[PDB]
Paper text:
BR187–385 crystallized in two crystal forms of the space groups P43212 and P4122, with differing unit cell parameters. The native P4122 dataset that diffracted to 2.0 Å was solved using BR187–385 from P43212 as a template for molecular replacement (MR). A single BR187–385 molecule was found in the P4122 asymmetric unit, and a model comprising residues L203–S378 was refined to R- and Rfree-values of 17.7% and 20.1%, respectively. The structural deviation between the P4122-BR187–385 monomer and each of the three P43212-BR187–385 molecules was minimal, with root mean square deviations (r.m.s.d.) of 0.6 Å and less than 0.4 Å, following superposition of the P4122 monomer on the P43212 chains A and B/C, respectively. Crystal packing analysis revealed that two symmetry-related molecules in the P4122 crystal formed an intermolecular β-sheet resulting in an interface area of 585 Å2. However, a single population with a sedimentation coefficient of 1.85 S corresponding to a monomer with a hydrodynamic radius of 25 Å was clearly assessed using analytical ultracentrifugation (AUC). We believe, at the present stage, that the formed pseudo-complexes are probably owing to crystal packing. The overall three-dimensional structure of BR187–385, composed of 43% β-strands, 2% α-helices, 17% turns and 38% loop regions, can be described as a compressed barrel with two remarkably different faces. Furthermore, inspection of the electrostatic surface of BR187–385 revealed the presence of a highly basic groove with a solvent-accessible surface area of 180 Å2 that could easily accommodate the elongated and negatively charged helical rod domain of KRT10. A substructure within this region takes a paperclip form with back- and front-loops formed by residues 268–295 and 305–324, respectively, which provides a possible explanation to previous experimental observations.
Residue numbers in the entry: 202 to 378
The structure:
Amino acid sequence: LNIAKSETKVYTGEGVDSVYRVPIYYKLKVTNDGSKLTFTYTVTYVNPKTNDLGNISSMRPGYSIYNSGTSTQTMLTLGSDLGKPSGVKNYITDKNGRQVLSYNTSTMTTQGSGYTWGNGAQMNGFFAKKGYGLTSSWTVPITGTDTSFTFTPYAARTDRIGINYFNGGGKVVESST
């Protein structure tokens, strides 16, 4: 009878930055308000469990990472009753998730069985070392019952896009078929 107006899940996972041999993390927040899903995806060196930045004091200021692959990998697959994703806003967030500055909005394209985006933003080392994250957000219309999706996190240094620091592992899978 009294159904929730919205439901939000937060997922986190972790990989390894190959260059500095430190953990790197992601957070994916997904809110369903009945009309759309809102996705907020952050890659950061701050452990979301503790809000403590790992020791990256030796990271060079001009080192830089992407949070999205090319058609190096599908990032997002969507169930049958989800529409076309919006533009993907990109921005730097501080340790508490507050926006620091905004970058170009990316456009999602297919495929293969899903979507990726281009004009992908990046985060330089001097921001990473302040505990900042590289954050992308988008919405997806809900058109029916099958609101399943899978999301595959990605992070790579900008001169080696073929090496995903999350190594295809911590995939987010939401049912139901």
